[PDB]
Amino acid sequence: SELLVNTKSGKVMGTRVPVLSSHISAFLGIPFAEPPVGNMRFRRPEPKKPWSGVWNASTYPNNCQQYVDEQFPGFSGSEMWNPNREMSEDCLYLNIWVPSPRPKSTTVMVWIYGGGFYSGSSTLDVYNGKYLAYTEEVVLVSLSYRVGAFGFLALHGSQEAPGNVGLLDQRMALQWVHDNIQFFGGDPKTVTIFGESAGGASVGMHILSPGSRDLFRRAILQSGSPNCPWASVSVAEGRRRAVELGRNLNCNLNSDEELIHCLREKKPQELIDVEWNVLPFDSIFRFSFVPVIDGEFFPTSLESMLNSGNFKKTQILLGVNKDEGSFFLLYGAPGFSKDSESKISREDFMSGVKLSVPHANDLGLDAVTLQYTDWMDDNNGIKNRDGLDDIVGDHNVICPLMHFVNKYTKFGNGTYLYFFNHRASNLVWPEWMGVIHGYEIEFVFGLPLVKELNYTAEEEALSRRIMHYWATFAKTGNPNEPSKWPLFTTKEQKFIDLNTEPMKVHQRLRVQMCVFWNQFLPKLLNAT
Amino acid sequence: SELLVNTKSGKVMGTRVPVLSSHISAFLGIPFAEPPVGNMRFRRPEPKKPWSGVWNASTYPNNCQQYVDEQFPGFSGSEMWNPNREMSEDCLYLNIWVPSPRPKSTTVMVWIYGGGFYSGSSTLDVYNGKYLAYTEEVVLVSLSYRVGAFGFLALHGSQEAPGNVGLLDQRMALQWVHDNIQFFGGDPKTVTIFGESAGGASVGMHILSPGSRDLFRRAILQSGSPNCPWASVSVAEGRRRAVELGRNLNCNLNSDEELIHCLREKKPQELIDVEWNVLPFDSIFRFSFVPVIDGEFFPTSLESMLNSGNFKKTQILLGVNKDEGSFFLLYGAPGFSKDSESKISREDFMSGVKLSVPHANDLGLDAVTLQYTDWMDDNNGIKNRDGLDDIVGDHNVICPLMHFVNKYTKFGNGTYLYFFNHRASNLVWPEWMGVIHGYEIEFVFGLPLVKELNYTAEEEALSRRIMHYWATFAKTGNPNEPSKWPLFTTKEQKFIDLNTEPMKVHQRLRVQMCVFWNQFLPKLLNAT
Numbered sequence A, B: 001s002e003l004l005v006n007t008k009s010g011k012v013m014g015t016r017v018p019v020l021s022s023h024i025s026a027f028l029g030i031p032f033a034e035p036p037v038g039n040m041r042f043r044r045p046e047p048k049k050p051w052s053g054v055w056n057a058s059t060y061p062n063n064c065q066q067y068v069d070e071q072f073p074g075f076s077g078s079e080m081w082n083p084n085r086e087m088s089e090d091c092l093y094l095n096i097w098v099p100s101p102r103p104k105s106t107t108v109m110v111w112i113y114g115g116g117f118y119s120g121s122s123t124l125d126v127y128n129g130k131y132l133a134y135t136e137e138v139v140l141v142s143l144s145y146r147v148g149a150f151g152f153l154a155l156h157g158s159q160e161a162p163g164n165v166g167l168l169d170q171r172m173a174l175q176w177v178h179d180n181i182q183f184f185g186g187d188p189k190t191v192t193i194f195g196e197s198a199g200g201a202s203v204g205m206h207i208l209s210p211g212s213r214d215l216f217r218r219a220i221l222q223s224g225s226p227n228c229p230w231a232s233v234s235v236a237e238g239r240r241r242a243v244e245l246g247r248n249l250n251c252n253l254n255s256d257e258e259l260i261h262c263l264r265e266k267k268p269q270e271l272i273d274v275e276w277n278v279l280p281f282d283s284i285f286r287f288s289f290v291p292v293i294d295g296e297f298f299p300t301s302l303e304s305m306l307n308s309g310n311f312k313k314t315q316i317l318l319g320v321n322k323d324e325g326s327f328f329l330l331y332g333a334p335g336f337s338k339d340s341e342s343k344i345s346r347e348d349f350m351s352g353v354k355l356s357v358p359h360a361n362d363l364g365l366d367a368v369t370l371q372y373t374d375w376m377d378d379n380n381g382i383k384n385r386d387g388l389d390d391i392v393g394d395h396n397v398i399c400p401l402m403h404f405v406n407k408y409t410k411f412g413n414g415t416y417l418y419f420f421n422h423r424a425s426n427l428v429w430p431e432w433m434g435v436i437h438g439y440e441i442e443f444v445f446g447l448p449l450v451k452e453l454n455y456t457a458e459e460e461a462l463s464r465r466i467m468h469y470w471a472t473f474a475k476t477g478n479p480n481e482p483s484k485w486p487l488f489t490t491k492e493q494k495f496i497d498l499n500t501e502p503m504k505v506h507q508r509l510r511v512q513m514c515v516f517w518n519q520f521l522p523k524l525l526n527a528t
């Protein structure tokens, strides 16, 4: 039977699912690691022990334990990112969508979720892989990994909570896909890993990490890169936040063993309830437990690895959205709110810049303010709101990604860059937020092809172009079928806009502001 | 007789001169101080001893000893600023143009020349006061003062060469106008001092200095202000440059008395020949001997005097030209030349910025470069040439003047601001230089009214509007006759363009760049 597949871990039984009035197979909730529960909390993952009998893979797995957004109860805009399954520390599973009839050797795409390393589920409705697997004929895999303290609490030196285990969870799922995807009709030599936000940073982290490089072929990064300022911390800061988490839960702090034992006895929700208390600064776009530059998963600093070409050399396709920062300002800066146009006074602009560049002295804050203020009209509430939106997006997503692409391209085998700036006709978020962080995902996953969702015909057409670009790139290393999306090169630095208008090619994506964030501001903070 | 006037210093006999097919009287070369020769070189001026008999004032006086531009032998563009009379240390004289018939009590305008405190003559053809005195019916006075080492060598503490004597020369001529102008038909209670470049800085210096304030009524500053970075030095730097001048002429350096005696024995040209050797840095728009913040002519720092309102409170009319920096780049920065379009490579742009902000560390130079570079087109030779032109002009003239006007307006009785951007149809300098430092002077002095000079009819019309604005302001404290030039206010910050097109009013003259030069860059250089 088509729904029965034999893997090196055992037999798995899928389920048939309808898609655009046709059908494909889905294998949901396949375990790839042992449950990281009890004394395994915080430890590296262990491979799932093989089972006899048939694993029922007809239903979505539990989501990992994480913070749940309840800022707008019932609002679809926020709730579409929340876990939609019961949460459990027993959550290391992957999902596979397989074209019907079962392919023999087809391109594989593996999706990595990415809510800032503190949230995410492989089961969200915007991540339903059937539309993409069906439309582009690819085997689509979505994996999972521990987030928050469970995936990134880091006490370097300890083997009990070494840090980066959530990245080791992703790697284990990639090891499993590499070792078993052929039985599902996927080509193990043509696997593309792709992810958005923390998922985009994760993808870049597997490109960098020696131990992950051989498990995949190509990569796609959406609004995220490994060098993002929020994507990693030193082992000293990781240690400091682990100790502070311990202090918040009245743990004995005399030894790593003492701290970890105490943290292992707390119910999951006790850890999540105090997670945001360990940030070192009053800030925005900063998360508590994230990857650590440990000397193992990352052999040296990200920047020296990037400079010396110490990374997998292959093709990459990546890009950003027009208003990456709005989501974070709404949720964490004074003067912004969901139901108003959020016109910001000079005063709120300045407290917003301080929140956005937490690691800055007064001189650095003045440099940012001067750079984004129109001095002939400094009390313009709209310009203040938008300038702050650009500050958050440029500093946290765009300029770090531009620095990664320029460094990568020097040694890689082909780079395609995009700038997504289409505001969906049916967005439920306010107008001032623009093209929000995360809202290109629905186009990548094909949601506009389902009429009940209410997109315009031109949006369905953009979704089809995007899915075909992502799949053709996954399959060949070039998004174009043999109107051209040009290669990004060190000399020309070309990229394309991705929207409902005829393709336009441009050069040097936000160079002006990115020289400020990647070259001047850091020199400034280092001198002072 | 109309050409005979009795003053407190003695009888003076003028000469009748033709002007626009009419005639007026001129009294040229009236002495106002004793010749500052021999043991008087470097000393404060002494009032001219009265004489019996008639002083023949029918011919222009000698010009003070100064550097002579010979970069373009015979070129009118440069030679029009060079002394056109024999040079002599015996040069403290003033010139007066008096309407015919002799007025009884009319508005007086006193012109202060201004070639960077190192050059200037009251006798230049562009300073011929007959057109203005005739057309606007004012008594026009041009004074003179020692420039270079002769006027500003400063060894604070010594009474032999105290510094600022060139400013004391100007003040003595103002004392003489105040005491004697009534005999020429001028109103001593309505005297306006006006000057360009160092002359504009000098005018602001008499507004600041307690000892000069009571000698005049109102003020006009053209492309120059007291707080300009090149307009003054501390007593420690003045002392250092005096000692270095001594060292260049193999002087005994053991005591001030020894140094001064040696310097007094050198012929004038020996001092001028090594003048440029004492600058402390490789630089542009920096002059060797300039006013010193001494605690006497200036009681405290210029900035605290400005902040506390320690200055004459009256009306002022002032402004700048569109391309103040080109003159200096032509003469002192690599890649610029008179007969080419001077397209500047990135390399020359960067060595030009280093020359323009001599007092800057690497971080400060990076801040300037980032501010004036268009990163999407950094190899554009035209943008590089023009960005450097704006850097020199903004830093040396425009932003210092904007800072002076905002501070002054808080305590003054009326401010009128202009931005002169008309490129004369007959300019002999190349196109790339634009509206050059000093080229509004010919319009202020009415040269476009003389047909043989070849200006267009609309230029003659602009000249008439400008002369009438300057004279009406001198007479009433408002350039407008009772199309309006609005008052510059702390809140609105209005100014007008001055050119051949219908008047346009704007706000916040170069605010964007001036926040960089007046607030950010200094904070930057101070922190580092």
Ligand SMILES: O=c1ccc2c([nH]1)CCC[C@@H]2NCCCCCCCCCCCCN[C@H]1CCCc2[nH]c(=O)ccc21
Binding pocket: A081, A113, A114, A115, A116, A119, A120, A121, A196, A197, A276, A283, A284, A285, A286, A327, A328, A331, A332, A437, A438, A439
């Ligand atoms: O797989 C996933 C799962 C979720 C998401 C995706 N992907 C991609 C699109 C985005 C989506 N949400 C993440 C971002 C969703 C928007 C950004 C929200 C940040 C988390 C706020 C939680 C409350 C903490 N309140 C304050 C105090 C602590 C510091 C702080 N910092 C701030 O940046 C904002 C608020 C606060």
Ligand SMILES: O=c1ccc2c([nH]1)CCC[C@@H]2NCCCCCCCCCCCCN[C@H]1CCCc2[nH]c(=O)ccc21
Binding pocket: B081, B113, B114, B115, B116, B119, B120, B121, B196, B197, B276, B283, B284, B285, B286, B327, B328, B331, B332, B437, B438, B439
């Ligand atoms: O009364 C006057 C008399 C003259 C002038 C006015 N007014 C108003 C208009 C302008 C006119 N010329 C002054 C500026 C005329 C243009 C500016 C020229 C500056 C002096 C250069 C002399 C040579 C010294 N050569 C180098 C080495 C020393 C440092 C250095 N620094 C530089 O800024 C340029 C060159 C050099």
Ligand SMILES: *[C@@H]1O[C@H](CO)[C@@H](O)[C@H](O)[C@H]1NC(C)=O
Binding pocket: A412, A413, A414
């Ligand atoms: C990719 O690599 C192949 C062989 O290693 C080479 O022929 C090709 O030019 C490369 N393409 C790019 C864009 O570097």
Ligand SMILES: *[C@@H]1O[C@H](CO)[C@@H](O)[C@H](O)[C@H]1NC(C)=O
Binding pocket: B412, B413, B414
């Ligand atoms: C100037 O001063 C007079 C009297 O001191 C006052 O009535 C007038 O308003 C002032 N004008 C300005 C522009 O300050």
Ligand SMILES: *[C@H]1O[C@H](CO)[C@@H](O)[C@H](O)[C@H]1NC(C)=O
Binding pocket: A056, A058, A059
């Ligand atoms: C497996 O799970 C689904 C849902 O819980 C159930 O409907 C299905 O019949 C089960 N199949 C077997 C044979 O376990």
Ligand SMILES: *[C@H]1O[C@H](CO)[C@@H](O)[C@H](O)[C@H]1NC(C)=O
Binding pocket: B056, B058, B059
């Ligand atoms: C004074 O000087 C001028 C020129 O040197 C001369 O022509 C004129 O006649 C002289 N007048 C007297 C009486 O000194």
